[PDB]
Amino acid sequence: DVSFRLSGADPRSYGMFIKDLRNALPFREKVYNIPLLLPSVSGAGRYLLMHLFNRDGKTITVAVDVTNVYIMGYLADTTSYFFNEPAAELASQYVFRDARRKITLPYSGDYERLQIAAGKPREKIPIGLPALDSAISTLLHYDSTAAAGALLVLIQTTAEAARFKYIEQQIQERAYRDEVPSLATISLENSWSGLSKQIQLAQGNNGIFRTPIVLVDNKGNRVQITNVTSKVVTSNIQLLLNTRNI
Structure with missing residues (x-):
């Protein structure tokens, strides 16, 4: 445990x-x-x-x-x-x-x-x-x-x-004071399962997403992940939901 x-x-x-x-x-x-x-x-x-x-x-x-x-x-x-x-x-x-x-x-x-x-x-x-x-x-x-x-x-x-190393860092920041989550983090939260499916659907598609996940994240409003070299993939997301459960 x-x-x-x-x-x-x-x-x-x-x-x-x-x-x-x-x-x-x-x-x-x-x-x-x-x-x-x-x-x-x-x-x-x-x-x-x-x-x-x-x-x-x-x-x-x-x-x-x-x-x-x-x-x-x-x-x-x-x-x-x-x-x-x-x-x-x-x-x-x-x-x-x-x-x-x-x-x-x-x-x-x-x-x-x-x-x-x-x-x-x-x-x-x-x-x-x-x-x-x-x-x-x-x-x-x-x-x-x-x-x-x-x-x-x-x-x-x-x-x-x-799930997301960004959110882990949000909380670390907020260790001695609370604060509402960023739009960034709400977005991530909502996208886990879509991100998870697209990253899996990209093996055998050259790292390319079949459908592009649009995050609000840290481009204020309106980002689009389209392939696996993006850093929400290379650096951020930590765990994938198996597509059997998506």
């Missing part, structure tokens, strides 16, 4: 954690030097456990599907909470099986439902390491509106940071 401890966290130790997390996801191949995530895993081995601790040393254990890096649910001492979606009820079968009580959150774990449940879009919620510490704290006590908002910060500060 991977652990992180906000107490005395700095940008380095968080980098270590994010490295550890990438290093836990199995893969068989690299596609253009990037790990390609397995199309499925089976048994309890589909799920990775993150132990997160807040500044006071309280902990939650999050469970991550190692095939897409989706958060499935989490345990706060004796209760488990899973999202209201089929994979998450599947996960429930394999993890936190000694929770005294299991709650299903009234939403599924995707950005659109979570934002509806939270009352703010992602663009208006600060992320950083202080926020992650506050999200952990929020989660230790059930409040489903508060959790929609804390799970928005938890996903982005862990999963999205493992």
Whole structure:
């Protein structure tokens, strides 16, 4: 399992954690030097456990599907909470099986439902390491509106940071102060699975994309990736979603 401890966290130790997390996801191949995530895993081995601790040393254990890096649910001492979606009820079968009580959150774990449940879009919620510490704290006590908002910060500060090295650097920057994500980062977030498909569709097409991914990213508004030499590919994206799940 991977652990992180906000107490005395700095940008380095968080980098270590994010490295550890990438290093836990199995893969068989690299596609253009990037790990390609397995199309499925089976048994309890589909799920990775993150132990997160807040500044006071309280902990939650999050469970991550190692095939897409989706958060499935989490345990706060004796209760488990899973999202209201089929994979998450599947996960429930394999993890936190000694929770005294299991709650299903009234939403599924995707950005659109979570934002509806939270009352703010992602663009208006600060992320950083202080926020992650506050999200952990929020989660230790059930409040489903508060959790929609804390799970928005938890996903982005862990999963999205493992996928994109840019976002990992955003958070590192925001280690001692929170700040809303860049348009850049929201764009990346949204494009993972499109990027992932195009990079894979480019083997045997000469590194060229069949359809060009337009990022807002850091050309203010409106960039277009069209082949694999672009740096969102050579330098940024860290993990590929297997096209069996796209």
